[PDB]
């Protein structure tokens, strides 16, 4: 539902638990301090019916530039992988970018707190940190400015 609402669009979906809000909210901005905008954050709540929050996970895959998986001890990575995956293997002819994932790691949580499989789960993506002095180059690497635009240039087509 929306009353003549303006054009809203994200560049990435920050997947995190429900107790990792401020965490994500802390990233969105931190992202705006490097380049990528606030974007958003996809959290699953058992309070709602389910499809009362967002469309789907594969939506941010075709909508958001790169999906950001908040790999936190409070959040579920395995699932994210499953979903994100299905989304990818679901519609490849679209973006066919199975490497558009961004496993973020906040200070609140850590990778060591994750299973030994996680390493293999993100054994290809670009581990994004929030306490790394390189993370800046990591985000500016994946979420480049020429991409954030060239990626939204497909949505702006509306205004263009």
Coordinates of C-alpha atoms in Angstrom, one line a residue:
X1 CA 0.0 0.0 0.0
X2 CA 1.1 3.5 -0.9
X3 CA -0.5 6.8 -1.6
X4 CA 1.3 8.3 -4.7
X5 CA 4.5 7.5 -2.9
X6 CA 7.7 8.6 -4.5
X7 CA 10.2 6.2 -6.2
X8 CA 11.9 4.1 -3.5
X9 CA 14.7 1.6 -4.3
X10 CA 17.5 0.0 -2.4
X11 CA 21.0 -1.0 -3.5
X12 CA 21.3 -4.0 -1.1
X13 CA 19.4 -6.0 1.3
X14 CA 20.9 -6.2 4.8
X15 CA 19.7 -9.6 6.0
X16 CA 19.9 -9.8 9.8
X17 CA 17.9 -11.1 12.8
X18 CA 15.4 -9.0 14.6
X19 CA 17.8 -8.3 17.5
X20 CA 20.4 -6.9 15.1
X21 CA 18.6 -3.8 14.0
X22 CA 20.7 -1.0 15.3
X23 CA 23.5 -3.2 13.9
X24 CA 22.2 -3.0 10.4
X25 CA 21.0 0.6 10.9
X26 CA 24.6 1.2 11.9
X27 CA 25.8 -0.3 8.6
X28 CA 23.4 1.4 6.3
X29 CA 24.9 4.7 7.4
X30 CA 28.4 3.4 7.5
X31 CA 27.8 2.5 3.9
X32 CA 26.8 6.1 3.1
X33 CA 30.1 7.1 4.6
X34 CA 31.9 5.2 1.8
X35 CA 29.4 5.2 -1.0
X36 CA 26.5 2.8 -1.0
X37 CA 23.4 4.4 0.5
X38 CA 21.3 3.2 3.4
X39 CA 19.8 0.5 1.2
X40 CA 17.7 -1.4 3.6
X41 CA 17.6 -4.5 5.8
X42 CA 15.6 -7.7 5.4
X43 CA 14.5 -9.2 8.7
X44 CA 12.2 -12.2 9.1
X45 CA 9.5 -11.7 11.8
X46 CA 7.2 -14.5 12.9
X47 CA 4.8 -11.8 14.1
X48 CA 3.5 -11.0 10.6
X49 CA 1.9 -13.4 8.2
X50 CA 5.2 -13.6 6.3
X51 CA 4.7 -11.8 3.0
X52 CA 3.6 -8.6 4.8
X53 CA 7.0 -7.1 4.9
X54 CA 8.8 -7.4 1.6
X55 CA 8.2 -9.2 -1.7
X56 CA 10.8 -11.9 -1.6
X57 CA 14.6 -12.5 -1.1
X58 CA 15.1 -12.8 -4.9
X59 CA 13.6 -9.4 -5.2
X60 CA 16.6 -7.6 -3.7
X61 CA 18.6 -9.8 -6.1
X62 CA 16.9 -8.2 -9.1
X63 CA 16.2 -5.0 -7.3
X64 CA 19.1 -4.5 -5.0
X65 CA 22.6 -4.3 -6.4
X66 CA 24.3 -6.8 -4.1
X67 CA 22.6 -8.7 -1.4
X68 CA 24.3 -8.1 2.0
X69 CA 24.1 -11.1 4.3
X70 CA 24.6 -10.0 7.9
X71 CA 26.4 -13.1 9.0
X72 CA 25.9 -12.7 12.7
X73 CA 25.5 -15.2 15.5
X74 CA 22.1 -13.6 15.9
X75 CA 21.3 -14.0 12.2
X76 CA 21.1 -17.1 10.1
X77 CA 23.6 -17.4 7.2
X78 CA 22.9 -21.0 6.2
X79 CA 19.3 -20.0 5.3
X80 CA 20.3 -16.8 3.6
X81 CA 22.6 -19.0 1.5
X82 CA 19.7 -21.3 0.7
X83 CA 17.3 -18.4 -0.1
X84 CA 19.8 -16.2 -1.9
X85 CA 20.8 -19.3 -3.8
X86 CA 17.3 -20.4 -4.9
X87 CA 16.8 -16.8 -5.9
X88 CA 20.0 -16.9 -8.0
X89 CA 19.3 -20.4 -9.5
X90 CA 15.7 -19.2 -9.8
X91 CA 16.3 -16.5 -12.3
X92 CA 19.8 -16.4 -13.8
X93 CA 18.7 -15.1 -17.2
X94 CA 17.9 -12.0 -15.3
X95 CA 21.1 -11.0 -13.6
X96 CA 22.7 -14.4 -13.4
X97 CA 25.0 -12.9 -10.7
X98 CA 25.5 -15.6 -8.1
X99 CA 28.4 -13.5 -6.9
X100 CA 26.4 -10.5 -6.0
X101 CA 26.3 -11.5 -2.3
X102 CA 28.0 -9.6 0.4
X103 CA 28.6 -11.4 3.7
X104 CA 28.8 -8.6 6.2
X105 CA 30.3 -9.1 9.6
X106 CA 29.4 -6.5 12.3
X107 CA 31.3 -6.0 15.5
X108 CA 28.3 -7.3 17.5
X109 CA 28.9 -10.7 15.9
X110 CA 31.9 -12.5 14.5
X111 CA 32.7 -15.3 11.9
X112 CA 34.2 -17.5 14.6
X113 CA 30.8 -17.5 16.1
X114 CA 29.6 -19.1 12.9
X115 CA 29.9 -22.8 12.0
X116 CA 33.1 -24.0 10.3
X117 CA 30.9 -24.4 7.2
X118 CA 30.3 -20.7 7.0
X119 CA 33.9 -20.3 5.7
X120 CA 32.8 -22.5 2.8
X121 CA 29.5 -20.7 2.6
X122 CA 31.3 -17.5 1.9
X123 CA 34.2 -19.3 0.3
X124 CA 33.9 -17.1 -2.8
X125 CA 32.1 -13.9 -1.8
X126 CA 33.8 -10.8 -0.5
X127 CA 33.8 -10.9 3.3
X128 CA 32.6 -7.5 4.4
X129 CA 33.6 -6.3 7.8
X130 CA 32.6 -3.2 9.8
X131 CA 35.8 -3.0 11.9
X132 CA 38.3 -3.5 9.1
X133 CA 40.3 -0.7 7.7
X134 CA 40.0 -2.3 4.3
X135 CA 36.2 -2.9 4.4
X136 CA 36.1 0.6 2.9
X137 CA 37.8 -0.7 -0.2
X138 CA 35.7 -3.8 0.1
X139 CA 32.4 -1.9 -0.2
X140 CA 33.9 0.6 -2.6
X141 CA 35.0 -2.5 -4.5
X142 CA 31.7 -4.3 -4.8
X143 CA 29.3 -1.4 -4.3
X144 CA 31.3 0.8 -6.6
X145 CA 29.8 4.3 -7.5
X146 CA 29.9 3.4 -11.2
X147 CA 27.8 0.4 -10.3
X148 CA 25.5 1.8 -7.8
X149 CA 24.4 4.1 -10.6
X150 CA 24.9 1.8 -13.6
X151 CA 22.8 -0.6 -11.5
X152 CA 20.1 1.9 -10.8
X153 CA 20.3 3.3 -14.3
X154 CA 17.8 0.5 -15.1
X155 CA 15.3 1.9 -12.6
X156 CA 16.0 5.6 -13.4
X157 CA 14.8 4.7 -16.9
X158 CA 11.5 5.8 -15.5
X159 CA 12.6 9.3 -15.0
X160 CA 15.1 9.3 -17.9

